[PDB]
Structure 1
Amino acid sequence: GPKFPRVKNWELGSITYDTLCAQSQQDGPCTPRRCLGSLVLPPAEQLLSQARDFINQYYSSIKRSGSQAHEERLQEVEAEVASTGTYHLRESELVFGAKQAWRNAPRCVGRIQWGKLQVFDARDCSSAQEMFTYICNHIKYATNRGNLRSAITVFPQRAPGRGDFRIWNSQLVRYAGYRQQDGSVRGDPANVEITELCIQHGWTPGNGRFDVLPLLLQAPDEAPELFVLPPELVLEVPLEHPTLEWFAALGLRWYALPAVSNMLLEIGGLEFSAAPFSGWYMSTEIGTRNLCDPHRYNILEDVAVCMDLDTRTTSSLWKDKAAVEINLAVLHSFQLAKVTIVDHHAATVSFMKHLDNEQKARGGCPADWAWIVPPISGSLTPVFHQEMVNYILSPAFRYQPDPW
């Protein structure tokens, strides 16, 4: 009937229509001739319309659309742009935008929590030293001794001519990756380049599998400066298994706080190049991707040998059995250490509740099926059977090229 994407849940048989995608201003990578949905990485007049659109979004969310404060906030932005080329956000606009960007993130399964985000304004920040203080404060608050709290810290926006604020690391917490003489990697292969960059900038490297990297923080038009995190601010969890007693002897560990620091937060055409955000982990991120990806820690064969599985034939499902127990260890160990974590079942169920909330609230929810479905036990989770529409809305978290 309706001329919007028809969306079906194959487990439940139910149908919905996504009208929200009509509000998308930005084109994605697809066309009628081919689908590029599986790809990980595929001005004056322009600023105003983005600005006008965002202010419109803001006033709708507080229900004052068409009003005198609404049209005066418009006039105030259009004037400020007309005389300087840019404009500034009010505090409550920034809070709304940060939440809306998270709410808008198609690849995040944790969005049931979007409304509950602690926004630290750091738009006053004027040094790389100051950035470090804001970051330490964020970690302290967000970690909260294992009882994790979502947070974002927003540093000053891009300015015409003047250079960006950048955190060079991809996360606030990352393990070093050390390239060997043989060509292998000790630690995390994901973090090789950033480890090398930290050395180039004078860090004295360690040589463990789990060395917490220092931060490389860059203030406008300055070279980055190197900052070591005080070990006590960085909460970690040693991995053991609830029944396989040798698993603890493996020496495996992970950090409590997932904090993405290299993404750009865009609100009303304003670009916040340093806006680190954090939540808590879904257990498969650590147990499946970080610990079992071939190009990460790659511990599957090690664990399967300890489990005494037949690693000579695929048809033994030794990979499947090891991944299950590793994920179990991650969950059991975070639960033992009283550190917030969510398994892929709980997470996906809660995301299904989120889709229903948003269907009523906005008439749809942009969602990236390949990223939403967990990397183990996919069809065992309800999201596998849920069709999804993906599109870009703004405010948004966006990828940005590396500063170097």
Structure 2
Amino acid sequence: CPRFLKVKNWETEVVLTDTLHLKSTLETGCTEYICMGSIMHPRPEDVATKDQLFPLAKEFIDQYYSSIKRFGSKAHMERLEEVNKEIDTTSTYQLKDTELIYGAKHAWRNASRCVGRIQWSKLQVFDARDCTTAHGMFNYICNHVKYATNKGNLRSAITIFPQRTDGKHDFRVWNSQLIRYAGYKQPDGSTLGDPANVQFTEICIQQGWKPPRGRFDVLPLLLQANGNDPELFQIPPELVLEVPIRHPKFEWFKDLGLKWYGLPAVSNMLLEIGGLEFSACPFSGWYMGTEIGVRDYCDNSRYNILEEVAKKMNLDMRKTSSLWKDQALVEINIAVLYSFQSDKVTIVDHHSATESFIKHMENEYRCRGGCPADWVWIVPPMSGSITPVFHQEMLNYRLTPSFEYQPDPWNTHVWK
């Protein structure tokens, strides 16, 4: 591999030079002969061995002491030595609070699929490594939700539960996101609520949940501590800020009865710091409008409202070339942004977000030597080429610390 890789912006002619890729740590899925850039996802007891762990820890500790301008210092060498002994005698080690915060912020900084990374240094890290029970997980998660929501002035935050040990004692949030709406399959094949969540809803019901069977039912939390069977908790509904969707011009848009929650909070990913694996690490930011207006509402296998919206707009739906779908899509996203702003809930439109990401990427090239980015995810799902990231060449590679996918827990859990 060469030391210097160039990327061009085809709209502005700006060229940037990447050296950070020399620190990439593992596989994209691509090869010399095949590109897997559009592929979404390219044993329990299989935990890191002592010989695997030493280099991953040293690499992270080295990186940490470089960041605080103490590389090679006495504190750096003593931390290296203490980590070595801890791995040598316990087969693992514990991060200092400073290292945990640094590692979590850098996993976000390194997330090539995230357009919101200009905020990466401003992340509230909640250390929940003392947690031992699912009730305690629930407490921790409620405090996160209340802190992050902040009455509509949203604040990015992560909560980190105890790391994996032998793989039989994992902490997991079984929910894929902290706040999601239930989905219910009817005997006639139709779905009520969010069709994407039918499987997880059936698990919850089997576990004891009494479903209201409405269109927008907040799912309960399903929380697994120390490898035990997961337990159900209802999030207090006063902690779940929601927005009813209305339109600045179409009086009838409120009659659709749409709403959405304020807080996007991912809870199914794994945080990897210095070889350590944090299998429960819920993190949250705030929404870009297209996540709701295009994907949640207009994906065919989600709420799928395009038809009903186009009918109330009195569009010609007989041909595709009238672009009735595109017309209705824009009006739906106008209503989502207008609703969040009217209720003073943080939200960013896709123009502002992508423009901020270009500024962030240019600063990272200048100050850090690069910025890994997944164009397929960064470009928004509508109006792609009228945002600046469409025209921006990007390089994608995997730096650590990192957020990683992990198996769904109901597939791997051994029931007690």
Q: Normalising by structure 1, report the TM-score.
A: 0.99
How much does 1:161 deviate?
Answer: 5.3
**2:163 aligned with 1:154, yes or no?**
no
Query: CA contact under 8 A between 2:134 and 2:225: conserved in structure 1?
Result: yes
Deviations 1:314-357 (A, max 9, x none): 11111111010000000000000000000000000000010011
Alpha-carbon distance between aligned partners in 1 of 2:251 and 2:272, rounded to the nearest angstrom = 48
Tell me, yes or no, if structure 1 residue 8 matches structure 2 residue 24.
no
Q: Contact 2:16 / 2:362 at 8 angstroms: preserved in 1?
A: no
Please tell me whether residue 46 in structure 1 is matched to residue 52 in structure 2. Answer: yes
Task: Tell me the residue number matched to 1:79.
Answer: 85
1:162 is displaced (CA, Å) by 4.2
Spell out, residue by residue over 1:152-208, the C-alpha distance to the aligned partner (whole angstroms, 9 max, x if none).
Answer: 000000012541000000000000010111112111111111101101101011111
How many pairs align?
Answer: 403
1:179-328 aligned at under 5 Å gives the runs: 179-328=185-334
**Does the CA-based 8 Å contact 2:3-2:22 persist in structure 1?**
no
Aligned AA (2:32): P
The aligned runs of 1:134-153 (5 Å cut-off) are: 134-153=140-159
- List structure 1 segments (4+ residues) > 4 angstroms apart after TM superposition: none
Question: Hey, what does 2:134 align to over in structure 1?
Answer: 128
Q: Give me the identity figure in percent.
A: 69
Residues 195-232 of structure 1 show CA distances to partners (whole Å, capped at 9, x for unaligned) of 01101101011111100000000011311100001110
**SS in structure 1 of the partner of residue 192 of structure 2:** strand
Secondary structure at 1:339 match in 2: coil
The residue identity in structure 2 corresponding to 1:337 is D
1:150, CA displacement in angstroms? 0.3
Q: How far does residue 3 in structure 1 lie from its aligned partner after superposition?
A: 4.5
Q: Distance in 2 between matches of 1:129 and 1:321?
A: 47
Asked if 1:23 corresponds to 2:20, the answer is no
- Matches of 2:196 and 2:229 in 1, distance apart? 24
Counterpart of 1:362? 368
The letter of the residue matching 1:6 is K
Instruction: Work out the CA distance in 2 between the residues paired with 1:283 and 1:56.
Output: 39
**Structure 1 residue 23, shift from structure 2 partner:** 0.2
Amino acid at match of 2:57: A
TM-score by length of 2: 0.96
SS in 2 for 1:271: strand
How big is the alpha-carbon RMSD for the aligned residues of Structure 1 and Structure 2? 0.8
Residue 393 of structure 2 corresponds to: 387
Cross-structure match for 2:120: 114
Q: 1:92 aligns with which of 93, 98, 121?
A: 98
Question: Shift in Å at residue 280 of structure 1?
Answer: 0.2
Letter in 2 for 1:217: L
Is 1:375 matched up with 2:381?
A: yes
For residues 16-68 of structure 1, give each alpha carbon's deviation from its aligned partner in whole angstroms, at most 9, with x where no partner exists. Answer: 22111110111110001110000011111111111001001111110101111
Q: Among residues 60, 77, 91, which one is paired with 2:66 in the alignment?
A: 60
User: In structure 2, the residue corresponding to 1:129 is in which secondary structure?
Assistant: helix
**Alpha carbons of structure 1 residues 336 and 95: separation in structure 2 relative to 1, 3 Å:** same
Distance 2:35 2:190 in 1: 36
Q: Which runs of 5+ in 1 are unaligned?
A: none
Using the alignment, how far apart are the partners of 1:14 and 1:166 within structure 2? Answer: 44
For structure 1, which segment, 281-290 or 152-161, has the greater mean C-alpha deviation from structure 2 after superposition?
Answer: 152-161
* 1:4 CA drift (Å): 2.8
Offset of 1:126 from its aligned partner?
0.6
What SS is found at the alignment partner of 1:286? helix
1:5, CA displacement in angstroms? 2.4
DSSP 3-state at the match of 1:320: helix
Q: Shift in Å at residue 114 of structure 1?
A: 0.2
CA distance in 2, matches of 1:6, 1:139: 41
Q: Which amino acid in 2 is paired with 1:104?
A: N
